[PDB]
Write an enzyme that holds these catalytic residues in place. Structure first.
Site, PDB file in Angstrom:
ATOM      1  CB  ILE A  18       8.997  24.410  99.637  1.00  0.00           C
ATOM      2  CG1 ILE A  18       8.990  23.157  98.982  1.00  0.00           C
ATOM      3  CG2 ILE A  18       8.918  25.498  98.839  1.00  0.00           C
ATOM      4  CD1 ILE A  18       8.037  22.605  98.201  1.00  0.00           C
ATOM      5  N   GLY A  23      14.868  14.977 104.930  1.00  0.00           N
ATOM      6  CA  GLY A  23      15.489  15.624 103.831  1.00  0.00           C
ATOM      7  C   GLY A  23      14.940  16.957 103.309  1.00  0.00           C
ATOM      8  CD  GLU A  24      18.550  20.597 102.494  1.00  0.00           C
ATOM      9  OE1 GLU A  24      19.000  20.865 101.190  1.00  0.00           O
ATOM     10  OE2 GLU A  24      19.131  21.542 103.485  1.00  0.00           O
ATOM     11  CG  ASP A 131       0.917  11.142 109.152  1.00  0.00           C
ATOM     12  OD1 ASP A 131       0.345  11.602 110.343  1.00  0.00           O
ATOM     13  OD2 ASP A 131       2.042  11.857 109.145  1.00  0.00           O
TER      14      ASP A 131
HETATM   15  C1  LIG Z   1      10.413   9.721 102.063  1.00  0.00           C
HETATM   16  C2  LIG Z   1       9.549  10.145 100.702  1.00  0.00           C
HETATM   17  C3  LIG Z   1       9.602   8.883  99.748  1.00  0.00           C
HETATM   18  C4  LIG Z   1       8.412   9.146  98.858  1.00  0.00           C
HETATM   19  C5  LIG Z   1       7.973  10.297  98.626  1.00  0.00           C
HETATM   20  C6  LIG Z   1       8.151  11.358  99.494  1.00  0.00           C
HETATM   21  C7  LIG Z   1       7.772  12.757  99.255  1.00  0.00           C
HETATM   22  C8  LIG Z   1       6.606  13.254 100.026  1.00  0.00           C
HETATM   23  C9  LIG Z   1       6.024  14.551 100.017  1.00  0.00           C
HETATM   24  C10 LIG Z   1       6.627  15.435  99.004  1.00  0.00           C
HETATM   25  C11 LIG Z   1       6.236  16.800  99.033  1.00  0.00           C
HETATM   26  C12 LIG Z   1       5.500  17.174  97.721  1.00  0.00           C
HETATM   27  C13 LIG Z   1       4.919  18.680  97.801  1.00  0.00           C
HETATM   28  C14 LIG Z   1       4.267  19.049  96.927  1.00  0.00           C
HETATM   29  N1  LIG Z   1       3.613  20.178  96.898  1.00  0.00           N
HETATM   30  C15 LIG Z   1       3.912  20.893  98.099  1.00  0.00           C
HETATM   31  N2  LIG Z   1       3.650  22.209  97.890  1.00  0.00           N
HETATM   32  C16 LIG Z   1       3.847  23.342  98.960  1.00  0.00           C
HETATM   33  C17 LIG Z   1       2.851  23.987  99.590  1.00  0.00           C
HETATM   34  C18 LIG Z   1       3.333  24.926 100.586  1.00  0.00           C
HETATM   35  N3  LIG Z   1       4.017  26.280  99.596  1.00  0.00           N
HETATM   36  C19 LIG Z   1       3.004  26.898  99.052  1.00  0.00           C
HETATM   37  C20 LIG Z   1       3.923  28.340  98.603  1.00  0.00           C
HETATM   38  C21 LIG Z   1       5.458  27.838  98.908  1.00  0.00           C
HETATM   39  C22 LIG Z   1       5.384  26.635  99.747  1.00  0.00           C
HETATM   40  O1  LIG Z   1       5.936  25.860 100.351  1.00  0.00           O
HETATM   41  N4  LIG Z   1       4.804  20.722  98.818  1.00  0.00           N
HETATM   42  C23 LIG Z   1       5.256  19.305  98.866  1.00  0.00           C
HETATM   43  N5  LIG Z   1       5.972  19.050  99.949  1.00  0.00           N
HETATM   44  C24 LIG Z   1       6.169  19.729 101.077  1.00  0.00           C
HETATM   45  C25 LIG Z   1       5.089  19.948 101.998  1.00  0.00           C
HETATM   46  C26 LIG Z   1       4.954  18.617 102.794  1.00  0.00           C
HETATM   47  C27 LIG Z   1       3.557  18.693 103.672  1.00  0.00           C
HETATM   48  N6  LIG Z   1       3.456  17.729 104.520  1.00  0.00           N
HETATM   49  C28 LIG Z   1       6.483  17.780  99.952  1.00  0.00           C
HETATM   50  O2  LIG Z   1       7.254  17.381 100.861  1.00  0.00           O
HETATM   51  C29 LIG Z   1       7.661  14.852  98.092  1.00  0.00           C
HETATM   52 CL1  LIG Z   1       8.453  15.948  96.951  1.00  0.00          CL
HETATM   53  C30 LIG Z   1       8.365  13.452  98.470  1.00  0.00           C
HETATM   54  N7  LIG Z   1       8.964  11.201 100.724  1.00  0.00           N
END
Ligand SMILES: Cc1cccc(-c2ccc(-c3cc4cnc(NCCCN5CCCC5=O)nc4n(CCCCN)c3=O)c(Cl)c2)n1
Length: 268
Positions: A18, A23-24, A131
């Site tokens: 997703i 990063g991925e 942000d």
């Molecule tokens: C550098 C650093 C330091 C500390 C923490 C992080 C970090 C930031 C954000 C996250 C993250 C969490 C997350 C939770 N739910 C979702 N739900 C996806 C919604 C969309 N749907 C629905 C169907 C399939 C799909 O795609 N997406 C998340 N996304 C991706 C979207 C970002 C939007 N701005 C994250 O990146 C993490 Cl894991 C770590 N980073």
């Protein structure tokens, strides 16, 4: 802090890539609990210049405990790869949810009210999100609205004092909230057709943006209150939770499931 003993590849299974992100990012499952998580994997040899920024975001998220902020579960370090485990929200971002068509003012007010509750929490904890934009507001499949992707301590959502590289405070988030209100109503922030370097000088130079189009007076007034060039004159998140636009239009978050369902059927 980070776990260097456990192997995250045995603890988690990747389900979906997703976050098309630094990063991925994957939708994953905790193998033990069967709860779904969001997993960001960063190769620290590749991202060496950003390591302090990464550490700072982890620290801030680890200090937050609010239903309005995406939860941080922990991190793991395997070889050169840092795995960051977060709460997964399956509804979509607020930006994603603009795809089917325009939001109505009940949907806008409901989403803004929930963002304000998260800002109220952060500001009361002496934190600044930095942000706020529709892409960083994530909804659960039940309609709960949470903040994600804090900024580091593109210009379209930045307050003028932030652009001028001046001292700033929580009022910068209130400006960004006003831009996000325009974005929720129109689909895009002001100046979205212009080169970012031109926006860099326009934001401090120009009168603040206004909400243009056929929207109720209280919504236009909400935007105007947030978008004061003077940070001291912007209201607090607590004050905006009492704004006429919010009180007259915001409803139960569970109604947002209808918006989420529409996105399931109309999406790119
Ligand atoms: C550098 C650093 C330091 C500390 C923490 C992080 C970090 C930031 C954000 C996250 C993250 C969490 C997350 C939770 N739910 C979702 N739900 C996806 C919604 C969309 N749907 C629905 C169907 C399939 C799909 O795609 N997406 C998340 N996304 C991706 C979207 C970002 C939007 N701005 C994250 O990146 C993490 Cl894991 C770590 N980073």
């Amino acid at each position: 802090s980070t776990n260097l003993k456990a192997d995250p590849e045995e603890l988690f299974t990747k389900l979906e890539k997703i976050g098309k992100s630094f990063g991925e990012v994957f939708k994953g499952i905790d193998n033990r609990t069967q709860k779904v998580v969001a997993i960001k994997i960063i190769d620290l040899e590749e991202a060496e210049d950003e390591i302090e920024d990464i550490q700072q975001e982890i620290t801030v998220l680890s200090q937050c405990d609010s239903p309005y902020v995406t939860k941080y579960y922990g991190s793991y370090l395997k070889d050169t790869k840092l795995w960051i485990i977060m709460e997964y929200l399956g509804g979509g971002s607020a930006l994603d949810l603009l795809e089917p068509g325009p939001l109505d003012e009940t949907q806008i007010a409901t989403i803004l009210r929930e963002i304000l509750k998260g800002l109220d929490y952060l500001h009361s904890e002496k934190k600044i999100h930095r942000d706020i934009k529709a892409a960083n507001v994530l909804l659960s499949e039940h309609g709960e609205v949470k903040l994600a992707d804090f900024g580091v301590a593109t210009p379209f959502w930045m307050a003028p004092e932030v652009i001028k590289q001046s001292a700033y405070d929580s009022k910068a988030d209130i400006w960004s909230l006003g831009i996000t209100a325009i974005e929720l109503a129109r689909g895009e922030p002001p100046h979205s057709e212009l080169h970012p370097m031109k926006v860099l000088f326009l934001i401090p130079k120009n009168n603040p943006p206004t909400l243009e189009g056929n929207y109720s007076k209280p919504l236009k007034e909400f935007v105007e209150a947030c978008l004061n060039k003077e940070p001291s004159f912007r209201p607090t998140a607590k004050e905006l939770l009492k704004h006429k636009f919010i009180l007259r239009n915001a409803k139960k978050t569970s109604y947002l499931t209808e918006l989420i369902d529409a996105h399931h059927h109309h999406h790119h």
